[PDB]
Every structure is written in structure tokens, then in C-alpha cells.
């Protein structure tokens with residue numbers, strides 16, 4: 001059984017000044033429509049959405065940050081515009097806080113259904129995204145770090161040391177998710193992202209391969225940074241074969257969370273990459289071999305409505321047990337991609353004997 005959560009109330013979050021801003025309300029409604037259109041929806045068990053509580057938000061976020069975003073619910077447009085412009089790439093409406101609560105709570109229920117065995121796996125069609133949100137601030141269309149919160153929520157209903165793998169294949173680095181767990185060895189963060197030597201958003205060298213985690217978390221933060229332009233299925237398949245899967249198998253996670261941005265997809269207006277829907281299917285299908293299939297796919301970015309609808313639908317098809325579609329002939333890896341993969345291997349072979 002595959003769970004699915006979608007609540008159109010999360011469309012209420014909108015940009016009052018720029019109705020064509022790429023983080024559109026119809027992102028989640030188009031993904032949902034494509035599931036119904038491919039007759040995938042009726043094959044899933046519907047999981048209800050709910051508001052995350054403030055105590056649940058406190059699992060990852062400061063009390064100050066919670067109260068600021070919470071206060072935006074009663075703000076006038078002038079206060080909303082000014083508050084949004086205080087962050088890096090944030091727009092806010094009076095419904096933003098509620099929708100971020102719904103995004104988190106949707107994933108809490110989905111992780112709860114997985115960990116209790118109600119469903120084998122699940123998909124969360126939610127917005128606003130989360131992986132850029134930090135402990136104490138919002139960033140890059142994200143208010144609260146949904147994936148990070150779900151990992152802590154999972155631990156709170158099982159045991160504190162539950163091994164949670166977070167795979168972040170959104171094209172941008174999840175700076176918030178990395179920082180939140182950087183000193184933690186119970187949550188293994190693996191991110192593939194366009195980096196361009198720090199030039200690509202979020203424009204920090206924190207996303208480079210040499211950031212392996214700190215303290216107890218040393219070795220439990222894996223950055224796979226792409227440099228030198230367009231990447232696609234050949235590069236992502238290789239990164240999974242050489243890095244993501246062997247590290248994940250050695251970590252032996254008890255729950256797998258996918259920060260599933262689809263802005264690395266062919267056709268995305270911001271990513272500039274060419275990962276295909278079949279590619280995302282194969283990536284999903286491989287992660288399903290971990291944690292006894294307990295995988296939760298959480299929507300992050302991705303802004304070509306057609307690309308993200310086909311891509312995420314193909315992921316759900318894999319969760320439902322369908323056989324992987326056929327990849328195109330995988331071209332030779334771009335030379336810069338082999339350099340990136342080798343750099344990560346050298347950085348993490350000390351901590352992961354499966355890489356030696």
C-alpha cells in the first residue's frame with residue numbers, strides 16, 4: 001500500500017504582488033491532477049493533512065522564528081511585503097503560515113502511517129517547500145524545514161536514535177537540512193545539487209563536497225556538487241551507483257525521506273539540468289531497496305508544471321510497485337561529473353568502508 005497526501009488548502013499560499021512567481025499554488029494541483037490522470041490516485045491510500053503544532057515546529061526551529069512567521073497571519077500587505085523582503089527569496093501572504101503548518105503536518109501523518117505499517121511508503125504533494133529553511137530563519141521559498149521536522153517527528157514516535165536517511169535531489173543544496181543535522185549521526189543527509197563553485201543558489205561553499213559534518217555528525221553529511229553546466233540521467237545514475245546507494249546501505253536507515261525537488265528536471269526554468277521522469281523513477285526505485293521499502297517522497301522545488309507532474313507521478317508509480325521505465329542510452333559522463341564524484345568518494349571513504 002502506497003500513501004498519498006494532498007490538500008488544496010496549501011494552494012492558499014500565494015504571491016500578492018507577482019501572481020506569476022514560479023512557486024505557484026498550481027504546482028501541487030497539477031501534480032495531483034497528473035496522478036488522477038494516470039489512474040495512480042485510486043491505487044494509493046489517501047492520507048489526510050493536518051496542521052503541525054508549534055511544539056512540533058520546535059523540534060527544529062527557534063521560538064523566535066516560529067513566532068515571527070506565526071505573526072504574519074494577521075499582517076497587512078505593507079507588513080507582509082516588508083517582512084518577506086527581510087529574508088532571502090521569500091514572499092508571504094496571510095495564509096503562508098497555515099500552509100507551511102499543513103505541509104509539515106501532512107508529512108508527519110505520512111511518516112506515522114509508514115512507521116506503524118499502515119502503508120509501505122508514501123508521497124507528499126505539499127507546498128511551500130522546506131529544505132532551505134534554517135533553525136532561525138526562512139529562505140528560498142521555505143518557511144519551516146518540512147523534511148527535517150519529519151525526521152525529528154519520526155524519532156519522537158519510535159526511538160530517539162532512529163536512523164533516518166534524507167536524500168535531497170532538488171537541484172539546489174538544502175542548506176537548512178544540512179545545518180540542522182550537521183552535528184547529528186542519527187540523520188544522514190545526502191544532497192545532489194548544482195553548485196558551480198558556489199555561484200548557484202543558495203550561493204554558499206557550505207554545499208561543497210568537503211563539508212562532511214561536524215562533531216558526532218562527521219561523515220553523516222554527503223554533498224554531491226555538480227560543476228560545469230547541464231547534468232542529467234547519466235550523472236545522477238552514476239552518483240547513485242557510486243555514492244548514494246553504498247553509503248545508504250552501510251548506514252542501514254530505518255526510514256528514508258526524499259526531499260524531492262524536481263527542478264533538476266528537463267524543462268525546468270531555473271535548474272538548467274535534464275533529468276528525465278524515467279530518471280527520477282529509477283532513483284526512486286533504488287531508494288525503495290532501503291529501510292525495508294519505508295520511503296516518504298516530499299515535494300520541494302521544481303517549477304515546470306508539466307515536468308514536475310510527470311516526474312513525481314513516475315515516482316509514485318515506482319512506490320506502487322510498477323516496473324521501472326526504460327532509460328535512454330546513457331551518454332558518457334561529463335568529465336566534470338566524474339571529478340565531482342571522485343572528490344566525494346575521496347572525502348567520504350574515511351567514514352564509509354563501502355566506498356573503498
Ligand SMILES: O=C(NO)C1CCCCC1
Nearest residue numbers: 089140141170172201301
Ligand atoms: O527551488 C528552489 N530551492 O530549492 C528555489 C529557492 C530560491 C531561489 C530559486 C530556487
Ligand SMILES: [K+]
Nearest residue numbers: 168170172192
Ligand atoms: K539537493
Ligand SMILES: [K+]
Nearest residue numbers: 181184187220
Ligand atoms: K548529519
Ligand SMILES: [Zn+2]
Nearest residue numbers: 170172263301
Ligand atoms: Zn530547488
